[PDB]
Amino acid sequence: TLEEARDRIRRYFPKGDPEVLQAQVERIMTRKELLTVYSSEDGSEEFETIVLRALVKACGSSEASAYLDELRLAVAWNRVDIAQSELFRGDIQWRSFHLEASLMDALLNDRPEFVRLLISHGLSLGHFLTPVRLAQLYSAVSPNSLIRNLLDQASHAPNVGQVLRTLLGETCAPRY
Amino acid sequence: PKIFRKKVCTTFITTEKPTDAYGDLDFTYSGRKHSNFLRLSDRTDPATVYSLVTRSWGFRAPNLVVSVLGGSGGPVLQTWLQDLLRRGLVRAAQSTGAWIVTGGLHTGIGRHVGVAVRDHQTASTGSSKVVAMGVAPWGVVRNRDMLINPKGSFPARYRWRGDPEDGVEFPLDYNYSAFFLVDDGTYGRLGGENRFRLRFESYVAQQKTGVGGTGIDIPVLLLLIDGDEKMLKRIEDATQAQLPCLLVAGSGGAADCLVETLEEARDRIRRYFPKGDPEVLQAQVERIMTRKELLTVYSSEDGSEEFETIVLRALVKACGSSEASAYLDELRLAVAWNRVDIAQSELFRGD
Amino acid sequence: VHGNSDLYWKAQRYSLIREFHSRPALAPPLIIISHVRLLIKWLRRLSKEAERKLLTWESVHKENFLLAQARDKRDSDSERLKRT
Ligand SMILES: Nc1ncnc2c1ncn2[C@@H]1O[C@H](COP(=O)(O)OP(=O)(O)OP(=O)(O)O)[C@@H](O)[C@H]1O
């Protein structure tokens, strides 16, 4: 990847089988983008960044889908220090739904610092809270929890307002 | 009192009529606090504009006024210049206490300044906001037809972000504290608002800093980014009123003035930054060199706390005649900005 | 015991005031005419902008409280040792 003589290159790393393995070099250069190099840039926290650069380079077709995947993977790995200093420098013009998708990934999982980070970059929650998204927030409930049993009893007759009424009564209880 | 804001300011259509749009404007479904608002005509007296600001709406007196110009790079600016706008300008306006006079639209400079104001308010807890003010023509406003009802102190639910159409009407940035919408009744032209901008900044540069005045005159500096031809005509209309300027290193007319201050061929210099109109703009270069002292350079010396020192060096260089009055003005401005660390290490060295 | 008894008394003191507020408004000897009034009644069967000015005032004090708490946390010696 830094660059006949290539058959001579084959004739000292295994010392054997020149032309079949030369066809393997041909198929290596058919891909050309799923191969990365670690040797030039070495470091401790450089490794996870090189993993991200390998995933960005092998993404290919769309650019905005590549930066969307890099942001949502930084949410998935629970690392704010990558996304703050490598995704919000100012090179990428972030749109709305690019931030709303990662906000849903930061609400469904328990990452509070991404919630504060993504709200601070100019997102409007009056447009964000679709009632389908609110149903998806109350969907992500552990099966051995308390509200899993309480929301099952509220579906006997989501149904959050009935749960608040059976806890707090008529008074002292919000609507929805 | 609420009708008083309509009985003072009038608007022409040129058939002149008393105005009907004073606003406690807020944004729909958004966090930002109510903002002040006024629709105004052109060629009005800036004295009642200023008395509206510091008496009726309620804003303190400026210790500095820095108006930012340019608008060459449309959607995306260089991140080096985003470092300049965020960590050079807005935190200096937070510390010294200053007004930023920028176009209140979402296009060009007002978008980038609004990014810098929002990012600085997020990543800093100083318990005080950055007063940024916006001037823009009434004809380019996206939702100018909502702001009519003259009842009083009304929060008009200004629908930003809606009906995305490009090129003709522009929405209001929510990163501004007060809006001055100057009307010519044209409804679509770009704006003859440069005269009102020069008269308002000249009137601010007349007044005095402090409690009952009794201080120095408020310094007014102009910051340029790359810009166009009409920005250089805006340079000359600025520097006839004795207002200093400051130049950045990016491209455009700003770097044109940089390289022209670093040193026929000058007409060839004119024939690639706009690629047009050689001899009229060559006469503009002639008037630039008539001033020669109200122009400073930022590119050679860059730094975080270097910015406020460069503002002081621009004010010292443009002072001119007397030396002792220049150092007196530098000391009393360091008192006015409430910064001991400048005056101790730059005014009491021993020179 | 004296501290927990004073906290318990201060909490119940609202319930005692509230139950003298909702009584028949006469002395016990004369309450029979108010139970007759209640028995025949049984047999027959802040503005908006003042609220907004109130809640914006509350939000101002909430923002000052959170900023002063953050500045007191940042200037502590342990956090300054972390930044050093
Ligand atoms: N009228 C406005 N004034 C100031 N800032 C705005 C305005 N509208 C959007 N923004 C900021 O710009 C960002 C979005 O940019 P832009 O307006 O180009 O796209 P968008 O409106 O999100 O697109 P969509 O129409 O899909 O919502 C948001 O994070 C928001 O904070």
XYZ file of C-alpha atoms and ligand atoms in Angstrom:
642
model
C 0.000 0.000 0.000
C 2.984 2.372 0.184
C 3.472 1.989 -3.585
C 7.638 -7.466 -11.984
C 9.168 -6.374 -8.679
C 5.932 -7.335 -6.888
C 6.587 -10.983 -7.722
C 9.999 -10.508 -6.105
C 8.171 -9.080 -3.066
C 6.209 -12.337 -2.995
C 9.451 -14.331 -3.253
C 10.740 -13.462 0.209
C 7.887 -13.138 2.712
C 6.696 -16.792 2.260
C 9.325 -17.790 -0.327
C 6.791 -19.725 -2.370
C 3.757 -19.790 -4.746
C 4.248 -16.571 -6.776
C 1.323 -16.260 -9.197
C -1.650 -17.453 -7.098
C -0.649 -15.117 -4.277
C -0.046 -12.389 -6.863
C -3.731 -12.818 -7.732
C -4.422 -12.395 -4.007
C -2.582 -9.054 -4.185
C -4.857 -8.215 -7.142
C -7.969 -8.778 -5.024
C -6.422 -6.756 -2.167
C -6.256 -3.830 -4.574
C -9.845 -4.468 -5.645
C -10.932 -3.364 -2.169
C -8.367 -0.573 -1.446
C -10.530 1.178 1.195
C -11.163 -1.515 3.829
C -7.431 -1.522 4.690
C -5.866 0.924 7.142
C -2.378 1.561 8.519
C -1.414 1.813 12.197
C 2.359 2.302 11.887
C 2.500 6.014 11.034
C 0.381 7.177 13.999
C 0.891 5.373 17.313
C -0.525 6.231 20.720
C -2.622 5.074 23.649
C -5.862 6.976 23.017
C -4.946 7.086 19.322
C -6.220 3.491 18.950
C -9.961 4.168 19.345
C -9.654 7.141 17.002
C -7.973 4.900 14.408
C -10.871 2.436 14.788
C -13.257 5.313 14.045
C -11.170 6.415 11.046
C -11.289 2.854 9.708
C -15.074 2.857 10.078
C -15.441 6.290 8.458
C -13.204 5.385 5.502
C -14.962 2.059 4.867
C -18.400 3.730 4.986
C -18.137 4.892 1.391
C -21.135 6.331 -0.404
C -22.823 9.002 1.727
C -20.935 11.561 3.800
C -23.740 12.594 6.170
C -24.481 8.950 6.975
C -20.804 8.488 7.853
C -20.771 11.368 10.329
C -24.152 10.215 11.670
C -22.669 6.766 12.278
C -19.616 8.287 13.962
C -21.769 10.353 16.326
C -24.114 7.504 17.226
C -21.167 5.163 17.774
C -19.599 7.721 20.110
C -22.909 7.695 21.990
C -22.922 3.883 21.981
C -19.374 3.622 23.348
C -20.207 6.181 26.104
C -17.290 8.487 25.278
C -18.072 12.210 25.284
C -14.390 13.151 24.967
C -14.217 11.811 21.414
C -17.391 13.463 20.113
C -16.683 16.815 21.766
C -13.173 17.193 20.316
C -13.515 15.317 17.001
C -17.148 15.796 15.912
C -18.056 19.286 17.162
C -14.994 21.252 16.087
C -16.811 23.140 13.337
C -16.060 21.306 10.101
C -19.392 19.446 9.965
C -22.653 21.338 9.459
C -24.872 19.252 11.733
C -28.556 19.185 10.847
C -31.587 18.550 13.045
C -32.397 14.848 12.660
C -28.684 14.013 12.801
C -28.844 15.290 16.380
C -32.303 13.898 17.151
C -31.255 10.339 16.291
C -28.300 10.476 18.672
C -30.482 12.108 21.328
C -32.843 9.130 21.172
C -29.835 6.843 21.515
C -28.749 8.889 24.542
C -32.206 8.776 26.165
C -32.962 5.080 25.587
C -29.563 4.250 27.033
C -28.479 6.040 30.212
C -25.946 8.624 28.991
C -26.688 11.943 30.735
C -23.681 13.857 29.417
C -24.741 13.318 25.821
C -28.195 14.591 26.778
C -26.677 17.835 28.060
C -24.280 17.987 25.094
C -26.902 17.501 22.394
C -29.459 19.857 23.955
C -26.825 22.596 24.247
C -26.055 22.533 20.497
C -29.334 24.109 19.442
C -32.001 21.421 19.475
C -35.686 22.225 19.984
C -37.617 19.736 22.104
C -40.978 21.147 21.016
C -40.357 19.427 17.687
C -38.494 16.455 19.183
C -41.141 14.826 21.397
C -43.206 12.937 18.893
C -45.753 10.732 20.736
C -44.291 7.754 18.856
C -40.903 8.625 20.395
C -42.564 8.947 23.805
C -44.002 5.461 23.340
C -40.486 4.287 22.492
C -39.114 5.877 25.672
C -41.615 4.024 27.842
C -40.981 0.864 25.811
C -37.363 0.494 27.013
C -38.266 -0.901 30.434
C -36.484 -3.805 32.116
C -38.820 -6.809 32.572
C -37.953 -7.295 36.263
C -38.684 -3.676 37.190
C -41.525 -2.020 39.081
C -43.010 0.063 36.265
C -43.033 -3.009 34.012
C -45.569 -4.524 36.407
C -47.351 -1.190 36.884
C -47.715 -0.526 33.156
C -48.970 -4.085 32.719
C -51.649 -3.394 35.330
C -52.537 -0.134 33.564
C -53.112 -1.985 30.286
C -55.550 -4.305 32.084
C -58.301 -1.669 31.871
C -48.755 4.173 26.826
C -51.140 4.335 29.794
C -48.884 6.479 32.000
C -51.700 8.713 33.267
C -53.497 5.752 34.812
C -50.270 4.772 36.591
C -50.003 8.282 38.027
C -53.642 8.165 39.116
C -53.302 4.789 40.848
C -50.212 6.089 42.648
C -51.252 9.621 43.571
C -55.064 9.713 43.407
C -57.271 12.384 41.890
C -55.379 15.334 43.336
C -51.563 15.629 43.441
C -51.331 13.834 40.065
C -50.357 15.145 36.602
C -52.296 14.457 33.420
C -49.841 13.150 30.811
C -46.034 55.125 27.853
C -46.762 52.222 25.502
C -48.259 54.591 22.916
C -45.246 56.882 23.523
C -43.007 54.430 21.651
C -45.347 54.840 18.675
C -45.761 58.614 18.965
C -42.016 59.271 18.857
C -40.881 56.989 16.021
C -42.533 57.219 12.598
C -42.332 55.013 9.486
C -42.518 55.949 5.809
C -44.097 53.921 3.017
C -42.787 58.568 0.768
C -45.876 58.750 2.986
C -44.700 58.878 6.605
C -46.855 57.313 9.342
C -46.390 56.779 13.090
C -45.114 53.291 13.796
C -47.030 50.304 15.123
C -44.385 47.666 15.992
C -42.724 47.783 19.399
C -42.166 44.255 20.639
C -41.185 42.123 23.584
C -40.338 39.501 21.006
C -39.903 35.830 21.875
C -39.271 32.699 19.834
C -41.633 29.771 19.521
C -40.848 26.535 21.432
C -37.419 27.821 22.471
C -35.302 28.354 25.592
C -34.133 31.931 24.990
C -35.588 34.763 27.085
C -37.850 37.477 25.680
C -36.028 39.904 23.483
C -36.690 43.568 22.797
C -37.872 44.672 19.372
C -38.528 47.775 17.267
C -39.519 48.469 13.674
C -38.075 51.811 12.607
C -37.737 54.007 9.534
C -34.514 55.312 8.041
C -33.006 58.805 8.531
C -34.344 58.994 12.072
C -32.567 60.748 14.906
C -30.311 58.286 16.795
C -30.718 60.217 20.071
C -34.217 58.891 20.721
C -33.007 55.449 19.616
C -30.356 55.492 22.346
C -32.762 56.874 24.945
C -35.162 54.069 24.030
C -32.341 51.609 24.758
C -30.953 52.835 28.071
C -34.171 54.251 29.558
C -37.159 52.318 28.212
C -35.944 48.809 27.358
C -33.064 48.998 29.824
C -29.484 48.245 28.806
C -26.375 49.596 30.466
C -24.010 51.971 28.708
C -21.350 50.400 26.479
C -17.742 50.332 27.505
C -16.907 49.274 23.932
C -18.793 48.902 20.646
C -17.418 46.426 18.097
C -19.351 46.026 14.847
C -18.471 42.988 12.740
C -18.628 43.140 8.941
C -17.995 40.834 6.001
C -19.957 37.843 4.739
C -17.871 36.270 1.981
C -17.852 32.675 3.213
C -21.544 31.884 3.097
C -22.537 28.687 4.909
C -19.303 27.620 6.643
C -16.435 29.707 8.009
C -12.918 28.468 8.735
C -12.607 26.926 12.203
C -9.586 29.154 12.835
C -11.935 32.128 12.481
C -14.516 30.359 14.642
C -11.779 30.256 17.278
C -11.334 33.998 16.700
C -15.047 34.771 16.998
C -15.588 32.589 20.076
C -12.378 32.883 22.108
C -11.272 36.280 20.851
C -14.349 38.469 20.581
C -17.290 37.172 22.615
C -15.334 36.481 25.801
C -13.777 39.939 25.505
C -17.302 41.332 25.196
C -18.250 39.303 28.271
C -15.356 40.678 30.317
C -15.210 44.340 29.296
C -18.929 44.754 28.711
C -19.654 45.602 25.116
C -22.151 45.722 22.281
C -21.763 43.718 19.085
C -23.472 45.430 16.151
C -24.133 42.738 13.548
C -26.855 41.968 11.014
C -29.619 40.147 12.881
C -30.409 37.776 10.021
C -29.513 34.092 9.806
C -27.260 34.626 6.790
C -23.629 35.645 6.533
C -22.021 37.148 9.606
C -25.027 37.097 11.954
C -25.223 33.310 11.808
C -21.544 32.861 12.726
C -21.695 35.468 15.494
C -24.825 33.747 16.804
C -22.928 30.454 16.922
C -20.169 32.168 18.913
C -22.633 33.735 21.373
C -24.471 30.434 21.904
C -21.279 28.404 22.339
C -19.810 30.925 24.780
C -22.970 30.995 26.907
C -22.909 27.199 27.082
C -19.260 26.694 28.050
C -18.958 29.579 30.542
C -20.764 30.548 33.756
C -20.147 34.253 34.334
C -23.717 35.112 35.513
C -24.005 37.823 32.840
C -25.167 37.747 29.236
C -23.427 39.117 26.151
C -25.389 42.078 24.794
C -25.575 41.595 21.023
C -27.730 43.939 18.960
C -29.096 43.418 15.482
C -29.793 45.835 12.625
C -31.450 44.557 9.444
C -33.793 45.940 6.768
C -37.532 45.440 7.192
C -37.966 44.162 3.634
C -35.944 40.946 4.013
C -37.695 39.803 7.231
C -39.291 36.349 6.926
C -42.376 36.935 9.082
C -42.723 40.725 9.116
C -46.522 40.486 8.803
C -47.026 39.024 12.301
C -45.619 42.007 14.205
C -48.434 44.518 13.710
C -50.859 44.452 16.676
C -50.179 47.648 18.662
C -51.684 46.571 22.030
C -48.565 46.690 24.180
C -45.532 44.777 25.525
C -46.832 41.803 23.591
C -44.826 38.582 23.233
C -45.359 37.845 19.553
C -44.800 34.133 18.908
C -42.367 34.693 16.038
C -42.289 31.489 13.996
C -38.651 30.945 13.130
C -37.430 27.792 11.298
C -40.617 27.533 9.209
C -41.354 27.610 5.439
C -37.766 27.061 4.208
C -37.227 29.394 1.256
C -33.820 30.696 0.237
C -32.509 33.918 -1.264
C -35.468 36.280 -0.707
C -36.603 36.393 2.937
C -34.342 35.641 5.896
C -35.382 34.670 9.446
C -34.272 36.279 12.692
C -31.451 34.791 14.740
C -32.532 34.101 18.321
C -29.020 34.873 19.619
C -29.677 38.640 19.681
C -31.028 40.711 22.554
C -32.588 43.640 20.666
C -33.563 44.220 17.043
C -33.535 47.472 15.059
C -35.444 46.836 11.830
C -34.910 49.841 9.557
C -37.631 50.273 6.939
C -37.503 51.859 3.486
C -40.872 50.523 2.299
C -39.120 48.665 -0.528
C -39.948 45.068 0.551
C -37.275 43.020 -1.172
C -34.219 45.197 -1.693
C -31.005 44.514 0.203
C -31.024 47.747 2.160
C -29.845 51.331 2.322
C -29.262 50.794 6.035
C -25.533 51.648 5.973
C -26.313 55.321 6.596
C -28.286 54.547 9.768
C -25.501 52.233 10.946
C -22.922 54.995 10.522
C -25.079 57.649 12.203
C -25.894 55.394 15.157
C -22.272 54.404 15.730
C -21.132 58.018 15.395
C -23.692 59.108 17.990
C -22.581 56.352 20.376
C -18.945 57.389 19.896
C -19.870 60.946 20.952
C -21.139 60.048 24.432
C -19.238 59.468 27.674
C -18.688 56.399 29.850
C -19.789 56.094 33.454
C -22.545 56.838 35.930
C -23.365 60.467 35.190
C -21.164 60.513 32.144
C -18.007 62.236 33.460
C -15.645 59.752 31.838
C -13.927 59.074 28.531
C -15.735 58.790 25.217
C -16.972 55.292 24.347
C -14.476 53.664 21.955
C -15.925 52.198 18.763
C -13.914 49.716 16.693
C -14.860 48.011 13.424
C -13.948 44.389 12.726
C -13.821 43.163 9.130
C -13.851 39.716 7.566
C -13.290 39.073 3.854
C -16.299 40.825 2.334
C -17.055 42.328 -1.066
C -16.735 45.605 -2.989
C -19.524 47.339 -1.045
C -17.710 46.410 2.167
C -14.799 48.592 1.026
C -17.194 51.446 0.346
C -18.450 50.677 3.858
C -14.833 50.998 5.091
C -14.576 54.518 3.696
C -17.976 55.618 5.005
C -16.812 54.329 8.394
C -13.356 55.932 8.452
C -14.580 59.380 7.405
C -16.311 59.529 10.808
C -12.989 58.824 12.632
C -13.685 55.217 13.597
C -10.700 52.820 13.585
C -10.713 49.425 11.914
C -9.126 46.004 12.279
C -8.277 43.395 9.656
C -8.266 39.589 9.661
C -6.093 37.229 7.642
C -8.591 35.058 5.750
C -9.154 36.282 2.168
C -11.156 38.881 0.280
C -11.093 42.624 0.801
C -9.662 42.161 4.297
C -6.553 40.383 3.004
C -6.539 42.858 0.101
C -6.089 45.662 2.624
C -3.499 43.591 4.518
C -1.218 43.058 1.516
C -1.772 46.654 0.372
C -0.548 47.775 3.798
C 2.401 45.366 3.536
C 3.738 47.382 0.580
C 0.392 49.454 -12.140
C 0.519 46.179 -10.214
C -2.093 47.535 -7.778
C -4.660 47.540 -10.578
C -3.761 43.880 -11.108
C -4.361 43.369 -7.367
C -7.827 44.822 -7.949
C -8.348 42.473 -10.910
C -8.554 39.283 -8.866
C -10.225 39.896 -5.499
C -13.565 41.084 -7.050
C -12.511 40.693 -10.704
C -14.196 43.939 -11.688
C -14.315 47.790 -11.653
C -10.592 48.718 -11.589
C -10.337 52.516 -11.447
C -13.184 53.471 -9.071
C -11.978 50.918 -6.532
C -8.416 52.110 -7.152
C -9.663 55.505 -5.956
C -11.016 53.674 -2.899
C -7.479 52.383 -2.277
C -6.340 56.022 -2.567
C -8.702 57.077 0.226
C -7.596 54.077 2.330
C -4.081 55.493 2.166
C -5.398 58.943 3.067
C -6.200 57.578 6.529
C -3.249 55.152 7.068
C -3.526 55.154 10.896
C -7.087 53.956 11.582
C -6.192 50.526 10.128
C -4.556 47.772 12.175
C -3.399 44.207 11.530
C -4.328 41.128 13.573
C -2.528 38.412 11.582
C 1.030 38.865 12.868
C 0.137 38.623 16.580
C -2.555 36.114 17.558
C -3.650 35.047 21.025
C -6.505 34.799 23.495
C -5.708 37.714 25.819
C -3.837 39.354 22.936
C -7.185 40.556 21.512
C -8.011 43.197 24.148
C -4.435 44.463 23.976
C -4.755 44.803 20.187
C -7.979 46.786 20.726
C -6.019 49.115 23.019
C -3.187 49.416 20.479
C -5.737 50.339 17.809
C -7.142 53.027 20.102
C -3.687 54.357 21.013
C -2.537 54.502 17.375
C -5.712 56.248 16.181
C -5.477 58.835 18.986
C -2.965 60.922 17.070
C -2.019 64.384 18.251
C -1.147 64.347 21.962
C 0.843 61.584 23.640
C -0.154 62.250 27.262
C -3.835 62.293 26.303
C -3.354 58.893 24.655
C -1.869 57.308 27.771
C -4.514 59.062 29.888
C -7.210 57.513 27.697
C -5.564 54.094 27.950
C -5.458 54.265 31.750
C -9.033 55.490 32.134
C -10.269 52.854 29.687
C -8.491 50.171 31.712
C -10.365 51.533 34.733
C -13.624 51.529 32.755
C -13.208 47.921 31.604
C -12.397 46.825 35.208
C -9.125 45.110 34.281
C -6.207 45.727 36.641
C -4.049 43.091 34.929
C -3.722 45.207 31.788
C -2.850 48.494 33.503
C -0.407 46.912 35.953
C 1.663 45.126 33.293
C 1.267 47.487 30.310
C 0.898 50.986 31.804
C 3.081 50.911 34.934
C 6.209 49.239 33.588
C 8.313 52.399 33.732
C 8.284 53.865 30.232
C -35.677 13.527 71.658
C -36.198 17.339 71.660
C -35.016 17.939 68.084
C -37.139 15.303 66.352
C -40.164 16.373 68.380
C -39.822 19.965 67.195
C -39.564 18.823 63.575
C -42.633 16.620 63.972
C -44.603 19.464 65.571
C -43.700 21.962 62.836
C -44.844 19.503 60.185
C -48.196 18.767 61.843
C -48.915 22.437 62.595
C -50.335 22.952 59.085
C -52.856 20.145 59.603
C -54.059 21.657 62.873
C -54.522 25.138 61.368
C -56.277 23.653 58.339
C -58.746 21.736 60.498
C -59.748 24.850 62.426
C -60.233 26.546 59.065
C -62.871 24.027 57.933
C -65.377 23.926 60.791
C -68.980 24.956 61.309
C -68.532 28.623 62.129
C -70.254 28.612 65.537
C -69.599 27.366 69.039
C -70.584 23.754 69.890
C -73.682 24.685 71.831
C -74.891 26.651 68.793
C -73.643 24.296 66.064
C -77.005 22.517 65.842
C -78.402 25.234 63.563
C -75.429 24.697 61.244
C -76.022 20.946 61.223
C -79.636 21.711 60.290
C -78.338 23.988 57.509
C -76.038 21.171 56.382
C -78.818 18.569 56.599
C -81.271 20.496 54.422
C -78.407 21.158 51.996
C -77.855 17.392 51.898
C -81.554 16.666 51.345
C -81.833 19.123 48.439
C -79.120 17.292 46.492
C -53.817 34.981 40.785
C -54.696 35.939 37.212
C -52.962 34.672 34.089
C -50.397 37.429 33.555
C -49.785 37.700 37.299
C -48.984 33.985 37.228
C -46.591 34.534 34.321
C -44.832 37.404 36.086
C -44.598 35.199 39.186
C -43.114 32.177 37.405
C -40.548 34.240 35.514
C -39.463 35.741 38.843
C -39.065 32.211 40.218
C -36.995 31.167 37.200
C -34.624 34.110 37.732
C -33.894 32.950 41.280
C -33.472 29.358 40.129
C -30.816 30.412 37.621
C -28.916 32.469 40.202
C -29.032 29.555 42.636
C -27.633 27.047 40.149
C -24.882 29.417 38.979
C -23.767 30.170 42.540
C -23.745 26.455 43.357
C -21.599 25.745 40.290
C -19.137 28.524 41.134
C -18.816 27.261 44.696
C -18.157 23.729 43.451
C -15.543 24.880 40.938
C -13.546 26.961 43.448
C -13.183 24.167 46.000
C -9.731 22.806 46.778
C -10.380 19.243 45.605
C -11.617 20.308 42.165
C -8.694 22.701 41.785
C -6.355 19.828 42.608
C -8.044 17.819 39.840
C -7.468 20.598 37.309
C -3.860 21.028 38.461
N -34.183 30.980 12.713
C -33.046 30.577 13.321
N -32.262 31.451 13.975
C -31.131 31.058 14.579
N -30.679 29.797 14.602
C -31.373 28.818 13.987
C -32.624 29.158 13.300
N -33.095 28.015 12.774
C -32.226 27.031 13.102
N -31.198 27.512 13.818
C -30.074 26.714 14.342
O -29.443 26.060 13.244
C -29.450 24.645 13.411
C -30.102 23.997 12.204
O -29.734 24.643 10.989
P -30.755 24.844 9.755
O -31.766 25.897 10.133
O -29.893 25.101 8.548
O -31.503 23.430 9.495
P -32.877 22.908 10.175
O -33.877 24.027 10.324
O -32.534 22.054 11.367
O -33.449 21.891 9.070
P -34.952 21.320 9.191
O -35.770 22.239 8.312
O -34.840 19.895 8.702
O -35.284 21.436 10.659
C -30.252 24.324 14.660
O -29.450 23.590 15.589
C -30.650 25.654 15.260
O -30.096 25.782 16.570
